[PDB]
């Protein structure tokens, strides 16, 4: 649900969604966009539909499908290095995909910009050494850089408090045409457990499980951990509900 | 507080190339962009482009774009212009200054100017 | 772009006389983005003024800044000979960024 408000931040500040005890039907949010490219590594595309497991963490951010390229494990450029990787180590799916005009609430951020460039020049002569965004990490460039970058190339830089460390976390942001259809990406990066999976897909039983149009059939039956085998039938009420 | 020392008047010829150089005296371009700016004999001051040597970056005015082209060699730290492709309407002198950043960029240090005069 | 009015131009004023300069501009700009610059005779600019209302680091304090939003002023309390230059108001505000049109002080003594 809160997906669905708001204005959804830029690439490189995209927020996040942790489930660690739920049921999720996907489809019942993925019919809610126009989905244009699902790219799944360490598993399966269809198979994040429907398997149980520890944590699905979700990330949402606009971004344009005009470089749907730079995003992936493929690339070097600067949105998978200076902006947002997702762990290699375990499972990822990566949505690309469309609002549509039905759909209301979603608001349009002016442009999507993202952080070309992130480097700390040391307190030393001129050295200068590059910053790679780890595990999500934010890419600590992300105090200076504003949530949307103004104009075509900016120059954002700070000064360390001396020790530490005298560096100025340098960083630069560049931005990108908007386009008619707000055009988000979703990340989503679910990881096992030890023997424990606490997120599985809603699995409803139907009419066939039900005790009503089974009345004087001799039944098996499973109610919250109590089974057996016998006949129900509709009577009064006695006992305490 | 670093001193810009620039080059000296090129006489070119319209339609040729001319790379005003301006130098970090110091040796030290820190986070600090040279920005460029123009100055037609007796008028005011206009802006021509900006880079930063810590990133290479570079960025032009639109009137002045597919003509400039402005580097710089952080190593021996020296920025130059090459105005290629010029008129004879582009004799001016030319200044090169110390930006500041996003919302500091005003034109702090200034550099002594270079006057190109461009006539055959 | 962001055309700019400037004051009317060259003004004649004796020493220890206070001295205002008008910076109009014909779109908005922010309340806090807009710098004075004073260029000597035959030299390079340097900044006098930056934010339209701090000083720059070694400035005397004769040469005031304030104004917001589409009016700035630029207030030099006293005058001495060694003010006589022209004065620019740069609009850092927009895109790309204007310079003024100047005006020149011409110390009346």
């Known amino acids: 649900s809160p997906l669905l408000s708001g204005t959804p931040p830029q690439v490189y500040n995209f927020k996040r969604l942790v489930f660690t005890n739920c049921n999720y039907n996907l489809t019942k949010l993925l019919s809610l966009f126009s989905v244009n490219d699902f790219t799944c590594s360490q598993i399966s595309p269809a198979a994040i539909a429907s398997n149980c497991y520890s944590s699905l963490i979700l990330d949402y951010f606009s971004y344009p499908l005009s470089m749907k390229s730079d995003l992936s494990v493929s690339s070097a450029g600067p949105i998978s290095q200076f902006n947002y990787k997702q762990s290699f180590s375990n499972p990822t799916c990566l949505i690309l995909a469309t609002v549509p005009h039905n759909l209301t609430t979603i608001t349009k951020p002016l442009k999507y910009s993202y952080i070309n460039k992130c480097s700390r020049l040391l307190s030393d002569d001129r050295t200068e050494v590059p910053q790679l965004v780890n595990a999500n990490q934010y890419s600590p460039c992300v105090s200076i850089v504003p949530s949307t970058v103004w104009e075509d190339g900016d120059y954002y830089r700070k000064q360390l408090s001396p020790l530490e460390g005298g560096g100025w976390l340098v960083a630069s942001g560049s931005t990108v045409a908007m386009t008619e259809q707000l055009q988000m990406g979703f990340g989503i990066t679910v990881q096992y457990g030890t023997d424990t999976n606490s997120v599985c897909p809603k699995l409803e039983f139907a009419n066939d499980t039900k005790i009503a149009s089974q009345l004087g059939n001799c039944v098996e039956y499973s109610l919250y951990g109590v089974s057996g085998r016998g006949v129900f039938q509709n009577c009064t009420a006695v006992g305490v509900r | 507080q670093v001193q810009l020392v620039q080059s000296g008047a090129e006489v070119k010829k319209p339609g040729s190339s001319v790379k005003v150089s301006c130098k970090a005296s110091?040796?030290?371009?820190?986070?600090?962009?040279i920005t460029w700016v123009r100055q037609a004999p007796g008028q005011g001051l206009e802006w021509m482009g900006r880079?930063?040597?810590?990133?290479?970056?570079?960025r032009s005015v639109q009137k002045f774009q597919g003509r400039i082209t402005i580097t710089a060699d952080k190593s021996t730290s020296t920025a130059y212009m090459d105005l290629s492709g010029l008129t004879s309407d582009d004799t001016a002198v030319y200044y090169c200054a110390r930006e500041g950043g996003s919302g500091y960029d005003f034109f702090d240090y200034w550099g002594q100017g270079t006057l190109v005069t461009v006539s055959s | 772009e962001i055309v700019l009015t400037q004051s009317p131009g060259t003004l004649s004023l004796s020493p220890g006389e206070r001295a205002t300069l008008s910076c109009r501009a014909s779109?908005?700009?922010?309340?806090?983005?807009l710098a004075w610059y004073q260029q000597r005779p035959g030299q390079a600019p340097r900044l006098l003024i930056y934010?339209?209302?701090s000083r720059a680091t070694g400035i005397p304090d004769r040469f005031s800044g304030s104004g917001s939003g589409t009016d700035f002023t630029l207030t030099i309390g006293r005058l001495e000979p060694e003010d006589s230059a022209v004065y620019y108001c740069?609009?850092?505000?927009?895109?790309?960024?204007?310079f003024g049109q100047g005006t020149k002080v011409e110390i009346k003594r």
């Open positions: 779109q908005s700009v922010s309340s806090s983005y």
């Open positions: 880079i930063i040597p810590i990133l290479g970056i570079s």
């Open positions: 740069q609009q850092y505000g927009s895109s790309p960024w204007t």
């Open positions: 934010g339209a209302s």
């Open positions: 110091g040796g030290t371009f820190s986070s600090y962009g």
